[model samples]
Target: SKLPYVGDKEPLSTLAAEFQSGSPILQEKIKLLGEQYDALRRTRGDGNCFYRSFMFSYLEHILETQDKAEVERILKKIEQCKKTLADLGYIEFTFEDFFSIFIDQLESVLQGHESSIGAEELLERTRDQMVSDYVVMFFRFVTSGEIQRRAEFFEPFISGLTNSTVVQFCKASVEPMGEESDHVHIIALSDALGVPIRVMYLDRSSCDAGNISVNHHDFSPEKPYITLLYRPGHYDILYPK
Candidate 1:
């Protein structure tokens, strides 16, 4: 069954309240993650949490900051993605509405006054499965194009994970709605959209010194606008304190 990707915002303390029953090691890590981040917005663990979290976090950041230049740059990249998908033989009619809706959201976020969107409204619209899933589909096609275009670059990684060729890997895993994502998807999408992301892992393992250390992946060279908390199988937006 399909589920809403974005969830209500909650305080950092809510993490402790919800997961205090976990192992001592896990509790410590959660506490640390909470301290570093002020709040969290959850995504359903319905196999698309990573991409969903990315969508909301990126859009939320744009809504808050209203960086017009960044939006312009990303929009250019999005146009390139459309061409890439078409060149890859994707029927334009199939994904054009998804592209249009996302661009509309981006423009609405920038234009102030009657057309402006508040944070609550942004979350509400994104929570609407139709809107959220369409953006996810946009990202899926972009990621697929990126992987296939740089097949020589991504092929080895795909080979390491599965025997299938790059195109096969993308067809089976990248473009599908419910298929999970990994480093390949992360690298491809980040590079494709020129949006940076930071993912902090909340796992049970601790460093050798017994100090709970959380590892993270920065899909950007400098500071990332979007940050997410990643557990075993789910991803949630993180708001830094």
Candidate 2:
């Protein structure tokens, strides 16, 4: 099954129900989350869930909002990334196709073009894992390139985890499709694209419901418009109310 999951849109209350069936603590927290978010879209539980969910959520935002200027800005950054990856010695031919597909997706989402993709068509195209995964791969490469290019800024973070250099870390941990991402990966990718993402942590490690601490970080300078529910290793889309 190439498309293990296709945008399962459901109300936040549904998420609340799933939690209500389990923990009173989680239930109360979900109730609060439900008040903030309206709906959710599930992605495959593969280790690539973070990238996949981000792929859908970010593209969908561009699609629905039709922010052409942001697309143009990101495309320029993407070009810079291509140069960075090339300087980093990645064969251009290897990643060029993935890069092209992402540009195609970006252009397709814009209006006034014959190739413009409608909302439904966008969903359909994203459901095809080939399209989705290729875009995810592009993001992975961009993230890897960013981390290595700015090694000095990121070296301390990597130092905390392992003895791997920036390049070694990208190869072993970031570039691979199924490798789970961490704060380092998120920060690199977010800073690379100048896009902010808010990740809502759903776990049982906390006892206080009122002070119910939620963890979030800015991948870039801007506030996050794309939100995702992160449960340990999995991620899913979250729509705000």
Candidate 3:
């Protein structure tokens, strides 16, 4: 149970072996997955798995691609998130640490600086508790702000999921560090940051024709730079072959 925050990349076949003795359906689906994704990196199964997966995948992307434009775009989004939080009555002292820490991380992944980091260092820092949790909090605040700022738009969906009002729902679910993410969280974060995500579902569901299939959904229409494998209650990074 003491898995790293993010594990080393493993072949998709390793994942198949995890469920080999348990489910014939899952085994077949893993075979289907192999055609598209060749490797995966697991995050700890703590409730924060979704955010942790996104954190590593996104940063690893910037580290590899060196996309300064994308970094600039997201940093501007972060500024807007800061304003959203301020407008919602949160003081600077409350969220600044989390916000700044993430900015430091974002910049550190890019080149042209003595402080720049490589892929391995990125993994090491993400595995560090102090750094990782602050970044998770940054996302939590951004997500909570987006939901509260657009309460009228999100209220209907929130109502269907729970009796809590938008504000109440965020206080209890969105802002908490370990609360498992759902469609609502994914939508808000993807929309807030303008970063699309693809979630590939690995489950027991079969096609109507009785063929095992690995299903997926894109959180936004744009091509997703980040892909995550979603099991029933956990998430892990996926790599295309």
Candidate 4:
């Protein structure tokens, strides 16, 4: 059965409230319209499907309005607000670490495989090379410094768990697949000589990783990480967990 979803509560509510039917509209409104998903779509549903669906609804809401400039003007607000929200989130969440002893142990396998490849180049190369972009982006964003820090922080815990080649392989290639999926990315290098692990940095997306074991995030009240299917191996934010 179809549901009359209450509609998005963030950017839209703010938009509908402030702008409503008669308010002094500005360029910000239109610009923000395009960036609407940034705020209202924070993380919900299995793969954040709720927010994704809401985003589409928000878009349809705009299309129904018809005034190109008016729509554009209102949407601009979304852009400004999204930047504000993201900056705020980075600052607030930055204070906390999500890793545990086990997560830390897995860090050892990561060793030294980070890089500084340009976003554009990484996408073009890895997508055509590896089979899973999620795996690829995970390593690509690690960068050397970040990788070292992660390894130093979690290697002891992860390595302590096992010397099994299987564990070693999984440790290096792990990444968040999707929320509903709850997959931790079980990977196998096929050869211990592969070195530094290669599955985590593949050229395919986790969602498309055939039968790979993934630990998707628990969206719950949060907007489930939806952009997991982003440009193949390209990454916008680094060091997520």
State each model's CA lDDT, in order. Answer: 0.85, 0.84, 0.92, 0.28
Model 3 has an lDDT value of: 0.92
Residue-wise lDDT of candidate 3 within 34-137, one digit each (tens)?
98988999999778998999999999999999999999999999999999999999999999999999999999999988999998899999999999999988
Choose the strongest candidate by TM-score.
Answer: 3
Error of 1 at 235 (Å): 0.8
**Candidate 1: tens digits of C-alpha lDDT, residues 15-74:** 777678767787777778876888898898778888899888888788888899999899
Pairs with backbone N, CA or C atoms under 3 Å apart (clashes), candidate 3:
none
Q: Which stretches of candidate 2 lie over 4 Å from their true place?
A: 1-3, 205-210, 213-215
Per-candidate clash tally: 0, 0, 0, 49
What are the per-residue Cα lDDT tens digits for candidate 4 across 80-166?
A: 323443443333242112212112222212224463233333223322313222332222222212223234454554455544232
Most lDDT-accurate candidate:
3
Over the stretch 1-241, how does candidate 2's per-residue lDDT look in tens digits? 4545446688877777676668676776677777788889988866788888888898889988989898988888899999999999999888998999989988998889789988888888787778988888999999999999998989978977978888899998988988888888888888788788998888775765567755554455455888989876788999988
Candidates sorted by lDDT, best first = 3, 1, 2, 4
lDDT of 4: 0.28
Could you tell me the lDDT of residue 109 within candidate 4? 24
